[PDB]
From a paper:
Kang A and Rif were soaked into crystals of an Msm RNAP transcription initiation complex (TIC). Both structures were phased by molecular replacement using the Msm TIC as a model and refined to 3.05 Å resolution. The Rif/Msm RNAP interactions were similar to those described in previous structures. The Rif/Msm RNAP structure reveals a set of cation-π interactions that have not been noted previously. The conjugated double-bond system comprising C16–C19 of the PK backbone of Rif is approached from the RNAP side by the guanidino group of R445 in a geometry indicative of a cation-π interaction. The opposite face of the conjugated double-bond system is approached by the guanidino group of R604. We call this arrangement a cation-π sandwich. Rif did not clash sterically with the DNA or the NTP substrates, consistent with findings that Rif has only very small effects on the Km for initiating substrate.
Residue numbers in the entry:
A (entry chain A): 51 to 100
B (entry chain D): 294 to 586
C (entry chain D): 879 to 906, 910 to 1011
D (entry chain C): 21 to 205, 215 to 311, 323 to 1139
E (entry chain D): 1123 to 1171, 1175 to 1195, 1202 to 1283
F (entry chain F): 351 to 466
G (entry chain D): 4 to 98
Write the structure that this text describes.
DNA sequence: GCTTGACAAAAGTGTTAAATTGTGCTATACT
């Protein structure tokens, strides 16, 4: 994963309402993601939880 | 002893009347400046309040003289005028010093010359210079004895005027204005240009305190990745340089004579033996010892 | 005090000097420190062996070999040039001063030995139990 | 331990802490609570102590009450000070640049004796700064700390100094009061030539009494026979003319001279400390003066006991100024109290004089009272005072040591440059009171220290230490805090001594400390008190060094000073091998969130954490998130609890900057290899695995604050705007409407943060500049561009913006219309050149960072993270770093002691339940009770999974590493393990400077140093010496003429380099031209002469 | 000094100074120490006069003038601090120490500084009279050999 | 009024007793000559000399006198008409034409980088 | 020049001090509290020490480099570079 | 290439009103 975009936050050093992890500590966790892309040409994933 | 002073005035044309002043000189304003800082508030030299006390008391004296005034009053003024000029020249040399707010003594004319902060030691026997820099140092075990690792960012600024001309000679930039901005924003073209200007152009590397002349040595600069300076491990003895966080200053010799002196007199590899005992200094040490042993 | 001392000429030509011990009585034994007293000097007069054998001529660099050669002839003292006896009008002369510790050769004529001396003395001051 | 949420960290201590570590912040709080004297302090003194507790404010108010002039016709009485609720909250103050304070009111009584009237008027003294929960103050928005000062307690101190002239003994005495002239034996107020007998006649005592009281004193009788002063009034004259030279005396002035100087309470202030010191050792009256002389006489004679009419017998002996019995600490409350007294004494002057010229009966407390000097004292103390210090907060520890710091400097104590080395030396009475190991390395050695762990300050200013008294070889549970004086009276058994089952001295003999101090033995019968525990002498920082006992005081002192310098990381991992203080020091720092009522969590969010107590009440805690610290470090907090969790009073709810699960985490645990490696880690340098960059293990966040204001100029009004006179539309691409950087943008060195413009006067453009204006039609703008840009060599993201406008109601100083502050933050990866270190004083820069591929890696394929050189270890005497390197591996892989048939012999000496520990379990080795050498070896061989059942480290702490470049094993076994290393606040990004040309000083044309001004380096005297030794004249001349001071030469040389021409010849240094001018201003005619063309002019 | 003469004091002072540095294991060649010692014995006291009694005058400056073709002194040992203050350069002595003292005596004596010493030249920005700054070196003239210009 | 009451501070004051740094030596010299600008200005002065070479002898002559390039003293339309012997309006005309000629991209493209 | 032979000192006489002076400063006034401009006859007086801006007199009737070294008949300031403000000295005649 | 008259903005001058600035003064008795 190269970059990420979260709606409410404009940068990395803020928090999200209701979330227990700050944005910077969430990215730390996301670094552990092991993904495999069988296609060239950057592809965007999506995540939405309520 | 008394004859020494009396004799001095004879041979010299100085009239001994000079020791009493009829007129007092006023120093140029820019040497006693009054300027406003960022925000509007003002700051000024202490000499102006000192000059202000003298002028006030002298003018007040004229006032009392003209009206006619008992000696007690007039003599009191002359005594005050005398002390005012004393504080102007050497404040504190007689009696308590003239103080400002916070009870800190004002700076007299003598206070400009004397001390480690005076003109001689501060602004005359040493001074801050252009074309210089510094940073923390790291080991350079892969360097040749005559070389040193120089942070590319640091080198770019040091040689800024040089690269500006080179990239204008080449069509990279059309005018000097474009050359300046092309370096400030660090467009990728300059780096290839920086290697050329830096080639065989020596620099001086100093670490304080400078104990012997070996505390300053010339080296051939090498662009290095990172913001630290790579130092040859054999010159640590001379610089007494520990890699526990020490820093070193870099100076850029400009004139042909200055570069000649760097390459010839101060070059790293030409200075090996200490100029005190003749013993070798760049001799291997501490790791190279046990490594060869 | 010594910043104005600089080599001003090659030779003042004076015959004056000082006597270095360089050995004593042995065996019946180089002096403890001939490296800082005798070496790097220049001979003021010819070192004559116990006859007219003169073994080293005046004006010799007095390196490591010359001291061993001299010791063989059994010379227990030597008269040498020194800046203390130099008669130069301004500064000192190369011959009196002697070899330059950094170059290993006779001091160049521009050298400012005054400052180099002050620094060579002060720099180790940090290592002196005061 | 005994902390509800305390994590499980096994300890090797063979003792049991009989007394918990007291609240390490009390020294700052109790002092302030005494000053304000709130009910929490009232109950303290009432329960056990005096029955008339007096708050510091009341105490100083009693001195003023009442006010009365020479006529005594009108009196003004002060009483009953009151405080209102705090104006604004601490968080609001730090945001609005105001000072956290509470208004103070007083009762002002004005009584006219002639009219017998009463004008009672409530008076407003001013906003009185209040102390926060963390023992700090908010002064004009910034958090500050008032350090406690060391001073010589007022009293009578004697000293015996041998005179070389007579080669005989001599005795001199000194009496230092709270205020007033000091005397020395006569030597009074720097006036020598005084016969001590003449003053005894000054009081009026006849010579007969001298022969009566002096008695056995031989020189006492011989001096009065030598003195030519005849009469009591004549001696007062011989004392008068020398004390007040130039003033003809009078019988009315000569007699009141002596009384007013000392006996009168006004000019000679009896100190509660001094009044107590001498009253027992022997306000002012003759009784104290004659007692000193009688004390001095016996000291020179040699008798150890002195008694006089109606006096208690006391020993006649010299006193030690450095003994903590005579050296006290001036805590914050007292430092404030003294500055209030100075304000009242300055107001008293206006109160007294105002009465005279004011219309009688038309004056009131409000008219006579003027609080300008009272509030000025407070305002002038918290700012500009040497003891009111900008709080040091790189981490919770650095702040926790700033408070508890003890200073000998500042007003009222010896200054930095003058003090001799005798004070700096450690003293026997420093045990358990002031840590001897924690002190500056530089010129302030011995003058600055931190309060010990169990130390406690006395209401009189003397430090006390906790002890457990022993009676008949049995150590009771009675714990008595003793001052230094009463400590020497008794014998102090050693903290660790064999304990007998229910309590009794088991060892045949016991370690003891004497008043020498001396170390001796007894059979346990003559001991009185024992040490509460080891590390009494140690401070908080010192007590956090594992294996402290093994490292030399030199490297330890460096180890303590460097903990303060660490920086909070993003992950903030706790130490794998630590001591007992880790968890206790974090909570007492204040940077951790603790729950004050038992209950359950209602919500948990990054923003706040709410708890529903059993009491039904509801507490909530707002979390500091990415708050810029005083020194730029990140003060972020993170919650460590879940929603349904139960909690107990005093538990840890969220972690602070450098804390994990409640304990201090100043660094990370790393895999260490102690082999020398290819000359890259050499001379204290270090090499790291590139893993430490990819995984952000040593990453830390730093935040800057940039500020710009728009004020009213004589030529108009500054306007913050997006319009800039001459700029591209691209440079403004990140600016919003108002002209301030948009939140979330990236900023590069030289970028614009806040656009500002100021009016311009009388442009008068150059003709070449006006022609282009007509050609390209860009109308010359009426205002110059003074805009806020990012400093050189600085970059980051824009976190937040704070705008204060004048249009909006907000508060600003007269002339300032709009003030905007921009906060930039950046993630700093661990970079080569950054300074790392361990707790043992071992420090070094990052020499190189290798790819994880080519690095000494264990047979597992597990690359080591750091490679430390072997040579710097042995000679420095810090071997603890090797011990924790072994233990660090033990705690990482686990272990299991052999249950085979029984406990081996090495575990026989009280390791309990420590036989087995899983992988990654943390360990705690208290400094002087920690693990021992034998126990280490036995553990070195222990549980052996990596994943497969193969060991990776032998019983010597070594392993066979494979070179990652050649791929072949290293010939010998290398020591590996895990060490705790910290990231220090010395970073390359901040320390790398470079300059070609830049600003120049105004008076002197030299470049102005410092990175803030983009300045150049200083080529100093010593450097010029080295340049001269080389014989490089042109290099030396260049540095001093065209590179700094030559106003015309420096612009030519630049012109030459740009054109490729030859560099021109240097000119005259502007500084020298200034010298001749400054010499002329002294009436010194300095003429620069030619060889034959006499006079030259510099123009 | 008064007992064994000037040339013997120097031998003593060098031995003493060299003994302290030998106790700490420092190797300094005697010549360096000699350069410093040489500066303490450069002057002599004037017992009788052009000159005044009790004054410390340079040895060389005392011989040429004393002759006056058709005034006795004794060798003087003085410390480095006192000696360096007696330097002929007044602005050199000023920047060194006791500036006010030096300036007042220089103005009364109406002193003139030739600007020969190397510190004086540093202050005013001149080329120090040492190393490459010496006359023979800085006045070197360089041109290619006629045989070289031919090869072009 | 509250701005008038402000009193100045001492340049010889020591900012921070910690570092013996005198406030005075932290003050820039705003009127100091900047090397890069004066050099570029010198280069700009040359580039204009060339551009005017393209213009006619009277076209350039009027431009120089109008802005006072040679003397540094600008001249009014009437005064320039007094040297060339024409009315001020004729000079106003010659001005507009030479300015549109200077605005011609061939001559202006080189001077663009000198905006500021 | 950069090459001088001798540098000499000597007691400055009252005449030497007067010859150095470009005028007597008679008032202890620095600058006007409103216009912040140098007060005449005081310390910083442009009439004595020199102009604040290059080739500009106090009132400004002569603002161009066209006439250098001329004094404005109104304000009395000389037209020249403000560098002289750093080179010129005044004096005080003591009563 | 260029000039003429009408014309309005811009720049100076002189004349006045408002403001700013300097100075004198205050009488129970007070040292
Ligand atoms: C008004 O406050 C000032 C008064 C000076 O006057 C003067 C002469 O009287 C002083 C008193 C009475 C002190 O008790 C004192 C001190 O306890 C201390 C340092 C040492 N300071 N340095 C630390 C090391 N670094 C290499 C250099 C600076 C000091 O210099 C002083 C000090 C002075 O110097 N503490 C140490 O060495 C230790 C064990 C830790 C330091 C932590 C941080 C760094 C500092 O606490 C920062 C946060 C500030 O708090 C201070 C720097 C204050 O500066 C300001 C602007 O706030 C200073 C107290
Ligand atoms: N330049 C030296 C003298 C040069 C030389 O030795 O010839 C002086 O002046
Ligand atoms: Zn010689
Ligand atoms: Zn004018």
């Amino acid at each position: 994963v190269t970059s990420i975009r979260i709606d409410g936050v404009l940068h990395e050093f803020t928090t999200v309402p209701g979330v227990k992890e700050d944005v910077t500590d969430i990215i730390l966790n996301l670094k552990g993601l092991v993904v495999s892309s069988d296609d060239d040409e950057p592809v965007t994933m999506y995540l939405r939880k309520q | 002893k008394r004859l020494k002073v009396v004799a001095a005035f004879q041979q010299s044309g100085n009239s001994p009347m000079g020791m009493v002043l009829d007129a007092v000189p006023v120093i140029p304003p820019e040497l006693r400046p009054m300027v406003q800082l960022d925000g509007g508030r003002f700051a000024t030299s202490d000499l102006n309040d000192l000059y202000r006390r003298v002028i006030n008391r002298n003018n007040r004296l004229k006032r009392l003289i003209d009206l006619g005034a008992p000696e007690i009053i007039v003599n009191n003024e002359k005594r005050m005028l005398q002390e005012s000029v004393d504080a102007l020249f050497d404040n504190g040399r007689r009696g308590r010093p003239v103080t400002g707010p916070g009870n800190r003594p004002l700076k007299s004319l003598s206070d400009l010359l004397k001390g480690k902060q005076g003109r001689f030691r501060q602004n005359l026997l040493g001074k801050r210079v252009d074309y210089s820099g510094r940073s923390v140092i790291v080991v350079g075990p892969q360097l040749k004895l005559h070389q040193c690792g120089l942070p590319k960012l640091m080198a770019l600024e040091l040689f800024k005027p040089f690269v500006m001309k080179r990239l204008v000679d080449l069509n990279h930039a059309q005018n000097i204005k474009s050359a300046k901005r092309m370096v400030e924003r660090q467009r990728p073209q300059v780096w290839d240009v920086l290697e050329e200007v830096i080639a065989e152009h020596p620099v001086l590397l100093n670490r304080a305190p400078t104990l012997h002349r070996l505390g300053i040595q010339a080296f051939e600069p090498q662009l290095v990745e990172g913001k630290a300076i790579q130092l040859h491990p054999l010159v640590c003895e001379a610089f007494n340089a520990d890699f526990d966080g020490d820093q070193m200053a870099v100076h850029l010799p400009l004139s042909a004579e200055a570069q000649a002196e760097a390459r010839i007199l101060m070059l790293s590899s030409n200075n090996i033996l200490s100029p005190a005992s003749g013993k070798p200094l760049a001799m291997p040490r501490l790791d190279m010892v046990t490594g060869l042993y | 005090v010594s910043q104005d001392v600089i080599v001003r000429e090659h030779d003042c030509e004076t015959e004056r000097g000082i006597n270095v011990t360089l050995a004593e009585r042995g065996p019946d034994i180089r002096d403890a420190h001939v490296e800082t007293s005798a070496f790097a000097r220049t001979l003021a007069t010819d070192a004559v062996d116990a006859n007219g054998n003169v073994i080293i001529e005046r004006g010799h660099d007095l390196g490591d070999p010359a001291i061993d050669a001299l010791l063989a002839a059994g010379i227990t003292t030597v008269k040498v040039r020194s800046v203390l006896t130099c008669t130069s009008a301004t500064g000192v002369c190369a011959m009196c001063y002697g070899r330059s510790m950094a170059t290993g050769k006779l001091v160049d004529i521009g050298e400012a030995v005054g400052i180099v001396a002050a620094q060579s003395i002060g720099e180790p001051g940090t290592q002196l139990t005061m | 331990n005994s902390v509800p949420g305390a994590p499980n960290r096994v300890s090797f201590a063979k003792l049991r802490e009989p007394l918990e570590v007291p609240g390490l912040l009390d020294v700052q709080t109790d002092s302030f609570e005494w000053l304000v004297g709130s009910d929490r302090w009232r109950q303290a003194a009432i329960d056990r102590g005096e029955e008339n507790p007096v708050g510091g404010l009341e105490e100083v108010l009693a001195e003023l009450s009442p006010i009365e002039d020479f006529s005594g016709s009108m009196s003004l009485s002060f009483s009953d000070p009151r405080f209102d609720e705090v104006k604004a909250s601490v968080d609001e103050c730090k945001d609005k640049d105001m000072t956290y304070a509470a208004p103070l009111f007083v009762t002002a009584e004005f009584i006219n004796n002639n009219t017998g009237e009463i004008k009672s008027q409530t008076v407003f003294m001013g906003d009185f700064p209040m102390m926060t929960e963390k023992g700090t103050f908010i002064i004009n928005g910034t958090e500050r700390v008032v350090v406690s000062q060391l001073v010589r307690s007022p009293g009578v101190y004697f000293d015996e100094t041998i005179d070389k002239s007579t080669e005989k003994t001599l005795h001199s005495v000194k009496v230092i009061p709270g205020r007033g002239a000091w005397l020395e034996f006569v030597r009074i107020d720097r006036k020598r030539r005084q016969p001590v007998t003449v003053l005894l006649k000054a009081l009026g005592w006849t010579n007969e009494q001298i022969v009566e009281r002096f008695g056995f004193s031989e020189i006492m009788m011989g001096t009065l026979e030598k003195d030519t002063t005849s009469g009591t009034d004549e001696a007062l004259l011989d004392i008068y003319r020398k004390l007040r030279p130039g003033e003809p005396p009078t019988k009315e002035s000569a007699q009141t001279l002596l009384e007013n100087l000392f006996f009168k309470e006004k000019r000679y202030d009896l100190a509660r400390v001094g009044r107590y010191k001498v009253n027992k050792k022997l306000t002012l009256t003759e009784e104290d003066v004659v007692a000193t002389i009688e004390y001095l006489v016996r000291l020179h004679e040699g008798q150890t006991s002195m008694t006089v009419p109606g006096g208690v017998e006391v020993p006649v002996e010299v006193d030690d100024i450095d003994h903590f019995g005579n050296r006290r600490l001036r805590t914050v409350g007292e430092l404030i109290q003294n500055q209030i007294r100075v304000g009242l004494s300055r107001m008293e002057r206006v109160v007294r004089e105002r009465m005279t010229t004011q219309d009688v009966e038309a004056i009131t407390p409000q008219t006579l009272i003027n609080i300008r000097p009272v509030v000025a004292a407070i305002k002038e103390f918290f700012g500009t005072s040497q003891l009111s210090q900008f709080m040091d907060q790189n981490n919770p520890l650095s702040g926790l040591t700033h408070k508890r710091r003890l200073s000998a400097l500042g007003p009222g104590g010896l200054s930095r440059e003058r003090a001799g080395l005798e004070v700096r030396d450690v003293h026997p009475s420093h045990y358990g009171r002031m840590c001897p190991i924690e002190t500056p390395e530089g010129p302030n050695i011995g003058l600055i220290g931190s309060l010990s762990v169990y130390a406690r300050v006395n209401p009189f200013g003397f430090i006390e230490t906790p002890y457990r008294k022993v009676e008949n070889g049995v150590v009771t549970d009675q714990i008595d805090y003793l001052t230094a004086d009463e400590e020497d009276r008794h014998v102090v058994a050693q903290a660790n001594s064999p304990t007998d089952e229910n309590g009794r001295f088991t060892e045949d003999r016991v370690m003891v400390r004497k008043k020498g101090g001396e170390v001796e033995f007894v059979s346990a019968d003559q001991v009185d008190y024992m040490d509460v525990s080891p590390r009494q002498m140690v401070s908080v920082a010192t007590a956090m060094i594992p294996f402290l006992e093994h490292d030399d005081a030199n490297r330890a002192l460096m180890g303590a000073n460097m903990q303060r310098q660490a920086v909070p990381l993003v992950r903030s991992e706790a130490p794998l091998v630590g001591t007992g203080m880790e968890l206790r020091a974090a909570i007492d720092a204040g940077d951790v969130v603790v729950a004050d009522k038992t209950g359950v969590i209602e919500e948990v969010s990054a923003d706040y954490i709410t708890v529903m107590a059993d009491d039904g009440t509801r507490q909530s805690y707002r979390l500091r998130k990415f708050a810029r610290s005083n020194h730029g470090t990140c003060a972020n907090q993170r919650p460590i609890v879940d929603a349904g969790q139960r909690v107990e009073a005093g538990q840890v709810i969220a972690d602070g900057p450098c804390t994990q699960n409640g304990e201090m985490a100043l660094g990370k645990n790393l895999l260490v290899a102690i082999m020398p490696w290819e000359g890259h880690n050499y001379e204290d340098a270090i090499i790291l695995s590139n893993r430490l960059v990819e995984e952000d293990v040593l990453t830390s966040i730093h935040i800057e604050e940039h500020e710009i204001d728009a004020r009213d100029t004589k030529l108009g009004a500054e306007e913050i705007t997006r319009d800039i006179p001459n700029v591209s539309d691209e440079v403004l691409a990140d600016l919003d409407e108002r002209g301030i950087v948009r939140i979330g943008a990236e900023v590069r060195d030289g970028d614009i943060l806040v656009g500002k413009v100021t009016p311009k006067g009388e442009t008068e453009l150059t003709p070449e500049e006006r022609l282009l204006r007509a050609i390209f039609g860009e109308k010359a703008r009426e205002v110059r561009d003074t805009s806020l840009k990012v400093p050189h060599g600085e970059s980051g993201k824009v976190i937040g913006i704070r705008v204060f406008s004048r249009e909006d109601d907000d508060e600003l100083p007269a002339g300032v219309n709009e003030l905007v502050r921009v906060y930039v933050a950046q993630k700093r990866k661990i970079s080569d050149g950054d300074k790392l270190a361990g707790r043992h004083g071992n420090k070094g820069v990052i020499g190189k960072i290798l790819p994880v591929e080519d690095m000494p890696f264990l047979p597992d394929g597990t690359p080591v993270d750091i490679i430390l050189n072997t040579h710097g270890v042995p000679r420095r005497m810090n071997i603890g770093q090797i011990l924790e390197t072994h233990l660090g591996w033990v705690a990482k892989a686990g272990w299991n002691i052999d249950v085979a048939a029984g406990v081996p012999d090495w575990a026989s000496k009280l390791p309990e339940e420590l036989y087995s520990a899983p992988a990654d379990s943390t360990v705690a080795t208290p400094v002087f009770d920690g693990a021992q050498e034998g126990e280490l070896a036995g553990l070195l061989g222990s549980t052996l999974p990596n994943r497969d059942g193969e060991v990776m480290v032998d019983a010597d702490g070594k392993s066979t590493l494979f070179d990652g470049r050649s791929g072949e094993p290293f010939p010998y076994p290398v020591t590996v393990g895990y060490m705790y290393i910290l990231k220090l606040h010395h970073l390359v990004d901040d320390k790398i400077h470079a300059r070609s040309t830049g600003p120049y000083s105004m008076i002197t044309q030299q470049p102005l140093g410092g990175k803030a001004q983009f300045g150049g380096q200083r080529f100093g005297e010593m450097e010029c010496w080295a340049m001269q030794a080389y014989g490089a004249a042109y290099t030396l001349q260049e540095l001093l003429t065209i590179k700094s001071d030559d106003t015309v030469g420096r612009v030519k040389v630049y012109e030459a380099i740009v054109k490729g021409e030859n560099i021109p010849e240097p000119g005259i240094p502007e500084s020298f031209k200034v010298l001749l001018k400054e010499l002329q201003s002294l009436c010194l005619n300095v003429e620069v002469l030619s060889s034959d063309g006499a006079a030259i002019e510099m123009r | 000094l008064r007992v064994q003469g000037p040339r013997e004091v120097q031998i003593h002072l060098v031995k003493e100074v060299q003994e302290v540095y030998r106790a700490q294991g420092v190797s300094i060649h005697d010549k360096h120490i000699e350069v410093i010692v040489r500066q303490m014995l450069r002057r002599v006291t004037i017992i009788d006069s052009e000159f005044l009694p009790g004054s410390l005058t340079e040895r060389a400056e005392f011989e040429a003038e004393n002759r006056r073709v058709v005034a006795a002194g004794r060798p003087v040992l003085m410390g480095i601090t006192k000696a360096s203050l007696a330097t002929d350069s007044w602005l050199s002595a000023a920047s060194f120490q006791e500036t006010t003292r030096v300036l007042t005596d220089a103005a009364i004596n109406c002193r003139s500084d030739k600007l020969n010493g190397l510190k004086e030249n540093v202050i005013i920005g001149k080329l120090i009279p040492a190393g490459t700054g010496i006359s023979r070196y800085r006045n070197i003239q360089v041109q290619p050999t006629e045989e070289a210009r031919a090869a072009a | 009024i509250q701005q008038y009451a402000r009193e100045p501070i001492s340049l010889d004051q020591t900012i921070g007793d910690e570092g013996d740094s005198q406030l005075g030596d932290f003050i820039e010299d705003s009127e100091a000559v900047v090397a890069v600008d004066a050099v570029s200005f010198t280069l700009l002065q040359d580039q204009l000399q060339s551009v005017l070479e393209t213009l006619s002898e009277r076209e350039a002559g009027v431009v120089r006198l109008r802005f006072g390039l040679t003397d540094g003293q600008p001249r009014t339309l009437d005064e320039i008409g007094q040297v060339y012997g024409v009315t001020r309006e004729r000079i106003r005309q010659i001005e507009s034409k030479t300015m549109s000629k200077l605005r011609h991209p061939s001559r202006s493209q080189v001077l663009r980088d000198y905006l500021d | 020049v950069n090459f001088f032979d001798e540098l000499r000192i000597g007691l400055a006489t009252a005449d030497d001090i007067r010859n150095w002076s470009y005028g007597e400063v008679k008032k202890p006034e620095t600058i006007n509290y409103r216009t912040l401009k140098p007060e005449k006859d005081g310390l910083f007086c442009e009439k004595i020490f020199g102009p604040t801006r290059d080739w500009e007199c106090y009132c400004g009737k002569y603002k161009r480099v066209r006439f250098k070294g001329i004094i404005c008949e109104r304000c009395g300031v000389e037209v020249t570079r403000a560098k002289v403000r750093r080179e010129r000295m005044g004096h005080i005649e003591l009563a």
